[PDB]
Amino acid sequence: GNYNYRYRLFRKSNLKPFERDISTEIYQAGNKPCNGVAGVNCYFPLQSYG
Amino acid sequence: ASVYAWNRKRISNCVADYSVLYNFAPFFAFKCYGVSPTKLNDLCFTNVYA
Structure with missing residues (x-):
């Protein structure tokens, strides 16, 4: 497994053409997300490839 | 129920x-898997088993 190529899995809205975002802020859940940890949702944006 | 006699149910x-x-x-x-937990309440399906 090569866990170095990752991709964004969660975002608030789709992005405009030729636009790039790099921020790795924790994604929103029903309620205020946890803190980079599991919970009701409180997910993390990036996901690896494998 | 116990796992060796799991219980199916249909939802439609x-x-x-x-x-x-x-x-x-x-x-x-x-x-x-292949289903965004957050984008689920707006997509529509045929039949949902439980």
Whole structure:
């Protein structure tokens, strides 16, 4: 497994053409997300490839 | 029920609302494959088994 190529899995809205975002802020859940940890949702944006 | 005699159930002909799930438990395990947990309450399906 090569866990170095990752991709964004969660975002608030789709992005405009030729636009790039790099921020790795924790994604929103029903309620205020946890803190980079599991919970009701409180997910993390990036996901690896494998 | 016990795992060796699991219990199937069908869910069709309703207005499914996935906003009731978060309020059940801290959900020690909550996962879906190829299905965005957050984008579920707006997509529509044929038949849902449980």
